[PDB]
Amino acid sequence: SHMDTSILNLRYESNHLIDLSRYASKINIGSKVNFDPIDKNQIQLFNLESSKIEVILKNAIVYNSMYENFSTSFWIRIPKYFNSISLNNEYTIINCMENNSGWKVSLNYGEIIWTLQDTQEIKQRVVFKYSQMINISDYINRWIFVTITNNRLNNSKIYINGRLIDQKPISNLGNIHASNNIMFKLDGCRDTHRYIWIKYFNLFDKELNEKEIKDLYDNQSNSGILKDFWGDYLQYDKPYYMLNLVDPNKYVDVNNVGIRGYMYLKGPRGSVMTTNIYLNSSLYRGTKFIIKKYASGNKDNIVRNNDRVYINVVVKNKEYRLATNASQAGVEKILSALEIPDVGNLSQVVVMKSKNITNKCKMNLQDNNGNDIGFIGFHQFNNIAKLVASNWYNRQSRTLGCSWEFIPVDDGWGERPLQ
């Protein structure tokens, strides 16, 4: 059983951002809106008057009620707040308020906020708060799924990545008369360099339930394409820093290249900070990995689930090949960084797998017959957490050391590489 209650379903199709709902509400795109070159559903809004999108709702669907239930969902990527200018500065990003009644999404330092206000200025807020004083954040500068539901008899709820975060009572609000238009735009933000990314805005004419929200979250994640740490499509030929999810305070290094050497995790990462604003683990540490095309016949640059690839490791501005001799005794096969011309018959083919919580990747090493050597993780040998391929992993959650994320340099993180 399924029920459609769509009032606005904003999507890039053909060659245009349009409303796919039967209403086909009219859209105006300002001249300073950016779109991602590969996924044109990703919309970037700057702190500029012309970086905006306005939706004019059909009259039959404007919200003007005491009892009508409604929900919204959208994905958002919010760059790290860098300066004290952001500290006590709530700014609207999605506005459907007219004359101090309606609804809006706003942001503040470490916050996503939903506000409802009735025509007698009775107001309620539901708030998601996330810290910037944290080693590794699930939320800072990463694609987040937002869902907000409204039941006029009881509660408004905000969900993040399909999980309930905050619920507050709204049964005391009366007539909420929202705007005829929805304005996507940074409104009242003092940080001149602030922006957001947004995608897949929806409005629904019901209170969505927990199952509907989960299904919506799973579907829109696009599990067929692997993601980087930030939640963008993972790509071939792109240098990435590595994060192991069970040892997040460690980074990948190599001692020596060639079959006598090995790679290993070491830490701590050390810190990036601006006093009273953020304090996080440094992300741009260790040897970079580059994903290389092997078996995929697709001619775009995206790494798909189950793609069979090679992995290059960058040491001193030179590319080596991640590889192992699977014959070595023990289920754990230690990985080395080989000269590319000299890899010979060593195992190097990696099956890339997306795992669906944040943006998880697995890497299943295979020999040249296509037989499994195993998922790449790590193993303690003496004092040293060496990288290995091990079928022990394949034969077993966030317990295991075989989950990884790939971190490219991104403007919304602000860290400067050490070199």
| CATH class placement of the largest domain | Mainly Beta
How many distinct helices?
A: 2
Shape: elongated
What fraction, in percent, of the residue positions are helical?
under 10%
CATH level-two architecture of the largest domain: Sandwich
CATH fold descriptor of the largest domain:
Jelly Rolls
What summary fits the major beta sheet? 11 strands, antiparallel
| Terminal CA distance | 56 Å
Radius of gyration: 24 Å
In percent terms, what proportion of residues is strand? 35-45%
Structural class: mainly beta
Total count of strands: 33
| Total domains | 2
Region (N-terminus of receptor binding domain (N-RBD)): 5-221
Binding site for a ganglioside GT1b (d18:1(4E)): 246, 332
Region (C-terminus of receptor binding domain (C-RBD)): 222-418
Region (Interaction with host ganglioside GT1b): 378-379
Structure keywords:
419 residues; mainly beta; Jelly Rolls; Trefoil (Acidic Fibroblast Growth Factor, subunit A); 2 domains; eleven-stranded antiparallel β-sheet; nine-stranded antiparallel β-sheet; 33 strands; 4% helix; 44% strand; Botulinum neurotoxin A heavy chain; toxin; receptor binding; monomeric
Protein model, in words:
The protein is mainly β. The chain folds into two domains: 6-220, Sandwich (Jelly Rolls), CATH 2.60.120.200; 241-407, Trefoil (Acidic Fibroblast Growth Factor, subunit A). Helix content is 4%, strand content 44%. The chain has two helices and 33 strands. It has helices at residues 210-220, 391-394, and strands at 6-13, 16-19, 26-29, 33-35, 43-46, 53-56, 64-65, 70-77, 91-98, 101-108, 111-117, 123-129, 144-150, 155-160, 163-169, 176-177, 181-187, 195-204, 241-244, 251-254, 263-266, 271-274, 278-281, 289-293, 308-314, 319-323, 333-334, 336-338, 349-355, 360-366, 372-381, 384-390, 404-407. The strands form six sheets. Strands 20, 21, 24, 25, 26, 27, 28, 29, 30, 31 and 32 form an eleven-stranded antiparallel β-sheet that branches. It is elongated, with a radius of gyration of 24 Å. A ganglioside GT1b (d18:1(4E)) binds at residues 246, 332. It is found in: Secreted; Host synapse, Host presynaptic cell membrane; Host cytoplasmic vesicle, Host secretory vesicle, Host synaptic vesicle membrane. Disulfide bonds join 361-402. Residues 5-221 are annotated as: N-terminus of receptor binding domain (N-RBD). It is a multi-pass membrane protein.
